[PDB]
Design a protein around this ligand. Structure first.
Ligand SMILES: CNC(=O)c1cn(-c2cc3c(=O)n(NS(C)(=O)=O)c(=O)[nH]c3cc2C(F)(F)F)cn1
Ligand SMILES: CNC(=O)c1cn(-c2cc3c(=O)n(NS(C)(=O)=O)c(=O)[nH]c3cc2C(F)(F)F)cn1
Lengths: 257, 257
């Protein structure tokens, strides 16, 4: 039996209605639960979904350099595979292997509905509507590193803005959009932006296209005999249109707006 | 010296001004020529750019099942690496290894400027403006396979439309957009759509977002000692913002519109 590490994060993995009367894999539902079943079928293995204990994606501890989260479970021999919204990054690809992306996503703009902003270009040209990101992590780093004129202009504004336009958590950012009288836009991953747009209270929306491109991938420990089959499975599901349909199911078919 | 197979395709690889008085790698310029230099630097190797003889990307011959194009050069031991706009596909991943994408792209709508169409949804609801794709290949297959309502509606229309909405070549599709009095929209890869939008006669444009997601990757033969280093190089260049800047250079800085 393959031990699959994953994470409780809507709509990827969620506790099912009446989970306390269910057992094993049947306790969970969501996009990644459906994806795990498809991968397992195509690769021909039995598996056990296990929620990562610390509830983390995976980063090196600053002090010890030990990996936490799902990446930790893989690199220290506790799980055979991670099927989760785990971003393909350099720091992680150095220590585990990723499949090709099963979901693409990018940095995107969230506004309260009514806010007179339709593009990053619009945001960049004005200051009455403040805008920012998580105070650490890849979204902030994108702007800090960008040589594209519009994003460089945005970074110049954000890094100097007072009061701070940076937030500690997604919840804080989204709350700030909702309660600041149209004076705050939040920059975050498109998947989460799109998900929140389809939940009550139905008062936010994504504007503009994605500002960059990255992907979520399935991760296996170095030397795994599953690496190849998992990669080919992902490309097959993509090309067959199954992953598009699955995204539509969990974002829109199950939507509230 | 690493033999790099590539393909003459603007703006990825083009003959330089005065190439006849230059030699070796100096004969060529473009996005992939710049990318090859960056990869080589980061991986620490010397290299020779070689244009694929048949001018093809890579497909199995129907009769012999022998691979042509750049994929052929890799699988039959003629080149060490392919640095080109080569799409990451299942059929290819079975026989060569791809880096993570160095460029993302998707199916997109091309119209003549003035055409009253702003989305796939718009196109799908009407028939006065015809629309189609290349008569074979991945774009047609996307629509044929899609379970998404809007794309299924589009496929139902396109497959039955008379006269045929399918074309043999990109040039034919683009010409059809330009000369059919606003009665034809062409569905193609976003990178090419974006490129043509920035060339004279400056009369076409991309409308709507991308309809799907795929990627171009660097390809290495199975068992290559370059596989890992090349993959990490691509992720580094992406995260540093170099690939965004490079795309901006060759599409927009060198643009004509
Ligand atoms: C209650 N959930 C949240 O607040 C939340 C979760 N996410 C989220 C974060 C990550 C993530 O941090 N990483 N690590 S990283 C920054 O790329 O190095 C991931 O790999 N994936 C994530 C996925 C999510 C998601 F799916 F919940 F949006 C974003 N907001
Ligand atoms: C003169 N050039 C053209 O007509 C042209 C070239 N392209 C193009 C095609 C491909 C391609 O066919 N494949 N094989 S595939 C269909 O994905 O199995 C690729 O891998 N990459 C391509 C890239 C281009 C590009 F870059 F020129 F747009 C699209 N139109």
């Amino acid at each position: 039996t393959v031990v699959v590490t994953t994470i409780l994060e809507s709509p990827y993995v969620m506790m099912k209605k009446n989970h306390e009367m269910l057992e094993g894999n049947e306790r969970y539902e969501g996009y990644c639960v459906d994806l795990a079943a498809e991968i397992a079928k195509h690769c021909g293995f039995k598996y056990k979904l296990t929620i990562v204990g610390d509830g983390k994606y995976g980063a090196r501890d600053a002090d010890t350099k030990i990996w936490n989260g799902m990446v930790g479970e893989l690199v220290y021999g506790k799980a055979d595979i991670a099927i989760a919204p785990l971003t393909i990054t350099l720091v992680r690809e150095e220590v585990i292997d990723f499949s090709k992306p099963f979901m693409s996503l990018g940095i995107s703009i969230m506004i309260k509905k009514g806010t007179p902003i339709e593009s990053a270009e619009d945001l960049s040209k004005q200051t009455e509507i403040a805008y920012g990101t998580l105070d650490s992590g890849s979204t902030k780093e994108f702007f800090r590193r960008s040589k594209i004129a519009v994003f460089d202009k945005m970074w110049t504004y954000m890094r100097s803005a007072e009061p701070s336009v940076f937030v500690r958590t997604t919840a804080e950012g989204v709350a700030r959009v909702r309660k600041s009288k149209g004076k705050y836009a939040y920059l975050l991953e498109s998947t989460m932006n799109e998900y929140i747009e389809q939940r009550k209270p139905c008062d936010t929306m994504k504007v503009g296209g994605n500002l960059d491109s990255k992907g979520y991938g399935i991760a296996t420990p170095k030397g795994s005999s599953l690496r190849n089959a998992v990669n080919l499975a992902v490309l097959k599901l993509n090309e067959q249109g199954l992953l598009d349909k699955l995204k539509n199911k969990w974002w829109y078919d199950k939507g509230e707006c």
